[PDB]
Amino acid sequence: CATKPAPDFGGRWKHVNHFDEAPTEIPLYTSYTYQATPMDGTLKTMLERWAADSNMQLSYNLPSDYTLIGPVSAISTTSVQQAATELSAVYAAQGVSVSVSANKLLVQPVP
Amino acid sequence: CATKPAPDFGGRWKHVNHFDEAPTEIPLYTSYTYQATPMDGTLKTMLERWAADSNMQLSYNLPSDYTLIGPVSAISTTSVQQAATELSAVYAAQGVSVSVSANKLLVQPVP
Amino acid sequence: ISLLSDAFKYAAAEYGPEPFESNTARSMQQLAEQAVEKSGRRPATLTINQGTVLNVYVAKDVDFSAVLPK
Amino acid sequence: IRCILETRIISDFGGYTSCIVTEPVYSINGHNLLLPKGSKMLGQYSAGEPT
Amino acid sequence: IRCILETRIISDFGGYTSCIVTEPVYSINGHNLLLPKGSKMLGQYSAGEPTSHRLQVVWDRVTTPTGLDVTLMGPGIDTLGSSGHPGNYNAHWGNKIASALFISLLSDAFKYAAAEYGPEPFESNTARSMQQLAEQAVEKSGRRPATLTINQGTVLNVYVAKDVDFSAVLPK
Amino acid sequence: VELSPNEKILDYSTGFTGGWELTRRENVFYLKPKNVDVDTNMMIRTATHSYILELKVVATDWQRLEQAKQAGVQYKVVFTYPKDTSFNNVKNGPLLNAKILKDRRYYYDYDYATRTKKSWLIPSRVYDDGKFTYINMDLTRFPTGNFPAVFAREKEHAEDFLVNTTVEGNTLIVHGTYPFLVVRHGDNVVGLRRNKQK
Amino acid sequence: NAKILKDRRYYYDYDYATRTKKSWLIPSRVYDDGKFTYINMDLTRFPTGNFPAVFAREKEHAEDFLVNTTVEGNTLIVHGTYPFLVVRHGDNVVGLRRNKQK
Amino acid sequence: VELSPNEKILDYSTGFTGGWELTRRENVFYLKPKNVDVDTNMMIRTATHSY
C-alpha cells in the first residue's frame, strides 16, 4: 500500500570520456550542392531556388510547368553544369532542355 | 467503469515525402472556355454571360426565350465560333441561329 | 477495513462465551466509518478527451473594421 | 466557431483550456475572412460537482 | 512550458517547488528564443486534504541561463493539459490500524478472561478503561491527513495564463 | 524622462526647486523650466537604480518650434537596461523560416500511418530544420474544415503530450523535433514517425 | 570557468550506466576541476527536449539528494564533486560513477 | 485628436499649459488655443502607445 519510488538505473558501467579510432574528417569550407528537395513541387519552383541560391537569373521559356518525378531525386552536385545535364536527361521525353549560358539558366524546348 | 481514452492510430507506415512517376503538366496560360453551366437557366442568360465574360455585345432578336436542354452540356471550346456552331446545331428544331459578326453575337431566326 | 473487523466479530460470536461482543470489531468498525466519510468527500469528474470537436457560440458582435485592408 | 480541443479537460480544480479553430470564419455576408483556419481559442472553466 | 520536476512534492505542509525546463520556448511566431533549454521554474503550493488525487501548484518565476528573471502567472497543468498535477495518493492505513488494533486487542484479552473464568457474565474494568484508550487512538489517528507525492523526475507542464513581453530585453 | 516600469521610485530631489515645474506619474517625470537660468541637477533613487540627471536650458528665445529642434532640445528621454556582462560571454535572421534556406540542414524522412486509406488528414509534406517540424497540408484541398491538433509522443503507442505550434497559411509548424507526432481531428487520427538516422 | 585553464587540475575518469543501449540521455563528456562537475551534453543533437535534472548520491543504490546547478548552453554544471550523479528525465535514468583514484 | 478605443490613457502633459484649453473624454482630446503664439508640444502616454 506504500508509495512507488522513482525509477533506478542499472547496467554495465561503460566509460564516458572515450576517444574513438576513426579520424572522421570534418570539412571546413563547404560549397553549395545543387539537389532536389521534396518541398519545391514543380520544375519551375526548383529552378527558381537554384537561381536564387547561386545568384543567377532564370529564363523559363516553356508554356507550361512540369512536376518533379522519381529520378529527379538523384542529383547532388556542387557544379551547376553537371546538374543541368542530369536534369535534361530526366525530362527528355517532354522536350525540356536546361542549360547555363555562363551567368543565367535557360529553359527552352529541345531543337 | 473507467474512462475511455482518445482513439489510437495503426497501419502500414507509408512514407510521406513521395515523388511520383508521371510528370503532370500544369498549364501556365489558361484561356476562357465557352461552356454551359447548370446555373444559367435559359438560352438568353447563357449568352448574356458569354458576352460579358469575353467583351462582346449581345443582340438577342427573338420574340421568346428557350430553356437549356440535355445536349447543350457538351460544348467546351476556347473558340467563340466553334461554340456558336455547336449551339445552333442543338437549337435547329426551333429556328434559332447564333453567329458572331466578329465583335458581337447575333441571335436571329434561320433563313 | 470493514471486512477485517468482520473477521474479529465472527471469531468472537462463536469460539467464545455467551453472544460474546468483541472490542476489536467495534474499534475497527469506527475506522471503517472514517473511510466512508473521507471517501465520500471526493467529487466526481468528467473528462473531455484531447481531440473532440467543440463548438463556440459567439454572443456579442465583434467589429473587425479597424483591421481589414481598405 | 468550430474548433477542436487541444487540452484534455478534467473537472477537478478549474483551469484553462485551448482549442484550435478548424474551419475559417467569414463575415456576416462573407466578403472578408475574419478568423483564419488555424487560430487558437482560449477559454477557462470553474470547479464544481458535475450533477 | 514543459519542465521536469526537481523537488519531490509531498502535500503535508505546503512549501516551494522547482522544476528544470527541458525544451526551449520560442515566441508567438518563432522568431526569437525566449526561455532557453535549462531554465529553472519556481513555484509554490498550499497545504490541504487531498480529496481529488491531484495537486495544484502556481508556478510564478523563471530564471534563464541567459540572465533573465521573469514573473509569469502559470498554473501547473498535466502533460496533456488537465488542470493540476497528478500524484500518488496514500491514505496511511498501515499506521491507522496498528495504533488501534494492538491496544483494542489487549483490552479484548481482559474481557475474555473475565466473561469465562469468572462469576455470573462478569464485566471487567480493565476491559472498559483500556477500551477508552483505544477510542483515543482512533480519534488521534483520524486527525492525520492523507498525502500525495510526486516523484523527483516526473515531466510536469505549465500553462502560461498572461502575456509576458520580452521586447525590452532582446537585442535589436 | 522615462524610467523602467519594473521598479518603484522611492524619492527624488532637484536643486533649485523653484525653477522647475516637474510632476510624476509612477515612472515618468514631465520636466519644464520656469526661467532662463535654472541649470541644476536632479537625482532619482529607485529600489535598485540610481540616476544623476544634469538639467540644462538650451532654447529660450524661440518663436518657431523648429528653432528649438536646432537648438538641441530633447522631447523624450528613455533609458535602456543591458544585462550583466558575465552573461554576454555566454542573430542571423529569424529562427522559424518556412522556406528552405541555403545554410540549414533538413531531414526529409517521415512516415504516416492511419486506418483509412485515402483520408483528408494525411499531411502533404513533413520535414524539419533541426529546431522546428514543418507539417504541410496544402494539397488536401477539398474539406475546408480540415485543420488538426498536433500532439507528440516518445514511443509508438505511449501516451502523447503537448507541443507549441505556430501556423502560416496551411503549414502547421511544431516547436521542436520529436520521434512521433500525432495528428487528431476527432475520431480519426494520423501518426507520424520520424525514421531513424542510418 | 567552463573552459580548461592552464593552472587547474582536472579528472577525466567517469562512467555511465543505463538500461537502454543508445539513449539521448547519455552525457557526451563528464569531468571536474575539483570544485564543479561539468556534465556536457552537446553531441546528443536530435531531441530538442533532452535536458535533464541532475541529482547526486553517496553510494551506488542509496537514496539520492539535491545539488545546486548552473547551466551554460548545453553544459550542465554541478556545484560540487560527488561519488555518484543521477540524471533523470522521467522514466529513464542514467547513473554516473566517478571512478576511484588509483 | 482621436486615439485608439482599445487602450486607456495614463497621462498627458503639454508645454505652456495656460495657452491651450483641452479636455478629454476617455480617448479624445478637444484642443483649442487661447492666443496667437502658443506653439508647443503635447505628449500622450497610454498603456502601450506613446504619441
Could you write out the DSSP letters of every residue in D1-51?
-EEEE-S-EESSS--EEEEEE-S-EE-SSSSSEEE-TT-EEEEE-------
CB G40 within 8 A of CB G10: no
Q: Which residues of G touch F197 (CB under 8 A)?
A: 46
CB B9 within 8 A of CB F114: yes
Q: Which helix (H) or strand (E) holds C34?
A: helix C24-39
Q: Which residue has cell 468472537? A: C12
Nearest to E83 by CA among C48, F148, D38, D21: C48
CB F124 within 8 A of CB F148: no
Nearest to F183 by CA among F158, F167, F164, F160: F160
PDB experimental method: cryo-EM
Q: How many whole angstroms separate alpha carbon E78 and alpha carbon E74? A: 12
For residue G59, the SS3 value is coil
Q: How many whole angstroms separate alpha carbon G17 and alpha carbon F188? A: 41
Q: How many whole angstroms separate alpha carbon G70 and alpha carbon F163? A: 26
Q: Are residues F77 and F95 in the same domain?
A: no
Q: Are residues F35 and F75 in the same domain?
A: yes
Number of structural domains (chain A) is: 1
Q: Which residues of A touch G16 (CB under 8 A)?
A: 13-16
Q: ∠ CA(E1), CA(E6), CA(E11), 5° rounding? A: 95
For residue F21, the SS3 value is strand
Q: Residue G29: which residues within 8 A CB-CB, separation 6 or more?
A: A16, A17, G38, G40
Read off the C-alpha cell for B96: 434559332
Say whether the H–A interface has 3 or more Cβ pairs within 8 Å: no
CB E83 within 8 A of CB D7: no
CB A96 within 8 A of CB A88: yes
Q: Are residues F83 and F177 in the same domain?
A: no
**Cα–Cα distances in angstroms (integers) from residue F133 to residues E129, F114, F149, F193, in the given order:** 74, 20, 14, 12
Q: Which residues pair with G31 in a beta bridge?
A: G38
Long-range contacts of B74-82 (CB under 8 A, 24+ apart): B75/B34, B75/B35, B75/B36, B76/B33, B76/B34, B76/B35, B77/B33, B77/B34, B77/B35, B78/B31, B78/B32, B78/B33, B78/B34, B79/B34, B80/B34, B80/B50, B80/B54, B80/B56
The neighbours of chain H, by the rule of 3 or more Cβ pairs under 8 Å, are F
Q: Are residues F104 and F23 in the same domain?
A: no
CA dihedral of residues E110, E115, E118, E119 (deg, nearest 10): 140
CB E3 within 8 A of CB E158: yes
Return phi, psi of residue F168, to 5°: -135, 90
Q: How many whole angstroms separate alpha carbon E19 and alpha carbon E21? A: 6
**Separation of CA B4 from chain center:** 51
Q: How many whole angstroms separate alpha carbon F162 and alpha carbon F182? A: 10
CA dihedral of residues A37, A40, A46, A48 (deg, nearest 10): -130
Q: How many whole angstroms separate alpha carbon F40 and alpha carbon C46? A: 69
> In terms of C-beta density within 10 A (0-12 exposed, 13-18 middle, 19 or more buried), how is residue C49 classed?
middle
Return phi, psi of residue E139, to 5°: -70, -40
Contact E168 F81 (CB under 8 A): yes
CB E156 within 8 A of CB E19: yes
Q: How many whole angstroms separate alpha carbon G46 and alpha carbon E51? A: 41
Q: How many whole angstroms separate alpha carbon F110 and alpha carbon B91? A: 58
What length is written for chain B? 111
Handedness of CA F176, G56, E7, G88 (dihedral sign): positive
Crossing angle of helices C24-39 and E93-115, in 10° steps, is 150
Q: Which residue has cell 522547482? A: E18
CB B97 within 8 A of CB B66: no
Read off the C-alpha cell for D8: 484534455
Q: ∠ CA(B86), CA(B91), CA(B97), 5° rounding? A: 75
**Cα–Cα distances in angstroms (integers) from residue F143 to residues F121, F137, F181, F191, in the given order:** 10, 12, 22, 20
Q: Which residues of C touch E146 (CB under 8 A)?
A: 38
Largest Cα–Cα separation, chain C? 99
Q: Which residues of H touch F (CB under 8 A)?
A: 10-11, 13, 15, 37, 39-41, 43, 45, 50
Q: Residue A89: which residues within 8 A CB-CB, separation 6 or more?
A: none
Q: Which residue has cell 494539397? A: F139
Kindly provide the b/e burial profile for residues A48-81, where b requires at least 16 CB atoms within 10 angstroms of the residue's own CB. Answer: ebbbeeeebebebebeebbbbbeebeebebeebe
DSSP class per residue in H14-46: ESSGGGEEEEESSSBEEEEESSS-----EEEEE
Q: How many whole angstroms separate alpha carbon E24 and alpha carbon G50? A: 10
Contact B13 F113 (CB under 8 A): yes
Q: ∠ CA(B63), CA(B68), CA(B71), 5° rounding? A: 130
Domain segments of chain E as ranges: 1-90+146-172, 91-145
Q: How many whole angstroms separate alpha carbon B35 and alpha carbon A31? A: 54
Q: How many whole angstroms separate alpha carbon C9 and alpha carbon C22? A: 6
Return phi, psi of residue A80, to 5°: -75, -30
Distance from CA of D4 to the nearest CA of F (A): 7
Q: Which residue has cell 477510542? A: E135
Contact D9 C48 (CB under 8 A): yes
The neighbours of chain A, by the rule of 3 or more Cβ pairs under 8 Å, are B, E, F, G
Long-range contacts of F37-41 (CB under 8 A, 24+ apart): F40/F14, F40/F15, F40/F16, F41/F14, F41/F15
Number of structural domains (chain G) is: 1
Q: What domain range includes position A32?
A: 1-111
Crossing angle of helices C24-39 and C4-13, in 10° steps, is 150
Nearest to G89 by CA among G44, G21, G16, G26: G26
Q: Are residues F14 and F1 in the same domain?
A: yes
Q: Which residues of C touch F187 (CB under 8 A)?
A: 51
Q: Which residue has cell 460470536? A: C13
Q: ∠ CA(A96), CA(A98), CA(A103), 5° rounding? A: 155
Contact F149 D4 (CB under 8 A): yes
Contact F91 E32 (CB under 8 A): no
Q: Which helix (H) or strand (E) holds B82?
A: helix B80-90
Q: How many whole angstroms separate alpha carbon E73 and alpha carbon E159? A: 9
What length is written for chain G? 102
Substitution target from F135, F161, F171, F174 for chain E, most E beta carbons within 10 A: F161
DSSP class per residue in A27-73: -SS----EE--SSS-BHHHHHHHHHHTTT-EEEE--SEEEB-BGGGT
**Cα–Cα distances in angstroms (integers) from residue E48 to residues E13, E56, E105, G64, in the given order:** 8, 10, 33, 27
CB G75 within 8 A of CB G39: yes
Q: How many whole angstroms separate alpha carbon B98 and alpha carbon B47? A: 10
Q: How many whole angstroms separate alpha carbon E39 and alpha carbon A9? A: 25
> In terms of C-beta density within 10 A (0-12 exposed, 13-18 middle, 19 or more buried), how is residue E39 classed?
buried
Q: Residue E67: which residues within 8 A CB-CB, separation 6 or more?
A: F83, F84, F86, F87
CB of E88 less than 8 A from some CB of A: yes
- The secondary structure of chain E, three-state, reads CEEEECCCEECCCCCEEEEEECCCEECCCCCCEEECCCCEEEEECCCCCCCCCEECCEEEEEECCCCCEECCCEEEECCCCCECEECEEECCHHHHHHHHHHHHHHHHHHHHHHHCCCCCCCCCCHHHHHHHHHHHHHHHHCCCCCEEEECCCCEEEECCCCCCCCCCCCCC
> With left for phi above 0 and alpha for psi between -120 and 50, is residue A95 left, alpha or beta?
left
For residue A85, the SS3 value is helix
Q: Which residues pair with F135 in a beta bridge?
A: F126, F172
Contact B28 A64 (CB under 8 A): yes
Nearest to G31 by CA among G95, G76, G87, G61: G76
CB D3 within 8 A of CB D22: yes
Question: For F161, which DSSP code?
Answer: B
Q: How many whole angstroms separate alpha carbon F48 and alpha carbon F2? A: 16
CB A56 within 8 A of CB A81: no
Parallel/antiparallel/unpaired status of strands G15-16 and A14-15:
antiparallel
Alpha helices in chain G (DSSP H): none
Q: How many whole angstroms separate alpha carbon E127 and alpha carbon E110? A: 5
Q: Which residue has cell 539528494? A: G65
Q: Are residues F67 and F5 in the same domain?
A: yes
Q: How many whole angstroms separate alpha carbon F150 and alpha carbon H5? A: 36
Q: Are residues F13 and F69 in the same domain?
A: yes
Read off the C-alpha cell for F128: 524539419
DSSP class per residue in B26-52: EESS----EE--SSS-BHHHHHHHHHH
What length is written for chain E? 172
Q: Which chain E residue has its CA at the smallest distance from G64's CA?
A: E152
Q: Which residue has cell 522556406? A: F99
What length is written for chain D? 51
Substitution target from B1, B3, B8 for chain C, most C beta carbons within 10 A: B3
CB of C49 less than 8 A from some CB of E: no
Q: Which residues of F touch H40 (CB under 8 A)?
A: 65
CB G56 within 8 A of CB G67: yes
- Residue A72, CA atoms < 13 Å, CB-side half-sphere: 26
Q: How many whole angstroms separate alpha carbon G76 and alpha carbon G94? A: 14
Distance from CA of E91 to the nearest CA of C (A): 10
For residue B72, the SS3 value is helix
Question: For F18, which DSSP code?
Answer: G
Read off the C-alpha cell for F110: 517521415
Return phi, psi of residue H33, to 5°: -80, 175
Q: How far apart are the first and last CA of chain C?
A: 75
Q: Which residues pair with H33 in a beta bridge?
A: H20
Contact F144 D5 (CB under 8 A): no
Task: State the count of interchain CB pairs (< 8 A) between E and F.
Answer: 52
Read off the C-alpha cell for A52: 536564387
Parallel/antiparallel/unpaired status of strands H9-14 and G75-79:
unpaired
Q: How many whole angstroms separate alpha carbon A108 and alpha carbon A97? A: 6
> Which of E4, E24, E38 has its CB closest to that of G48?
E24
Q: What domain range includes position F81?
A: 1-90
Q: How many whole angstroms separate alpha carbon A36 and alpha carbon F91? A: 28
Q: Which residue has cell 462478569? A: E122
For residue C6, the SS3 value is helix
Q: Which residues of C touch F184 (CB under 8 A)?
A: 50-51
Q: How many whole angstroms separate alpha carbon F170 and alpha carbon F98? A: 11
Parallel/antiparallel/unpaired status of strands G29-32 and A34-35:
unpaired
CA dihedral of residues B67, B70, B74, B80 (deg, nearest 10): -20
- The secondary structure of F36-85, three-state, reads CCCCEEEEEEECCCEEEEEECCCCCCCCCHHHHHHHCCCCCCECCCCCCH
Task: State the count of interchain CB pairs (< 8 A) between C and F.
Answer: 13
Return phi, psi of residue C33, to 5°: -75, -20
Q: How many whole angstroms separate alpha carbon A35 and alpha carbon A43? A: 12
Q: How many whole angstroms separate alpha carbon A3 and alpha carbon G40? A: 33
CB F22 within 8 A of CB F31: yes
Parallel/antiparallel/unpaired status of strands H29-33 and H20-24:
antiparallel
Nearest to G94 by CA among G32, G37, G14, G1: G14
Q: How many whole angstroms separate alpha carbon C13 and alpha carbon C21? A: 7
Q: ∠ CA(F99), CA(F104), CA(F109), 5° rounding? A: 80
Handedness of CA F121, F125, F127, F133 (dihedral sign): negative
Question: For F12, which DSSP code?
Answer: E
CB of B23 less than 8 A from some CB of C: no
Q: How many whole angstroms separate alpha carbon E165 and alpha carbon E168? A: 8
Kindly provide the b/e burial profile for residues G64-91, where b requires at least 16 CB atoms within 10 angstroms of the residue's own CB. Answer: beebebebbebbbbbeeebebbbbbbbe
CB of D20 less than 8 A from some CB of C: no
Contact E67 F84 (CB under 8 A): yes
Q: Which residue has cell 465574360? A: B53
Contact F144 D23 (CB under 8 A): yes
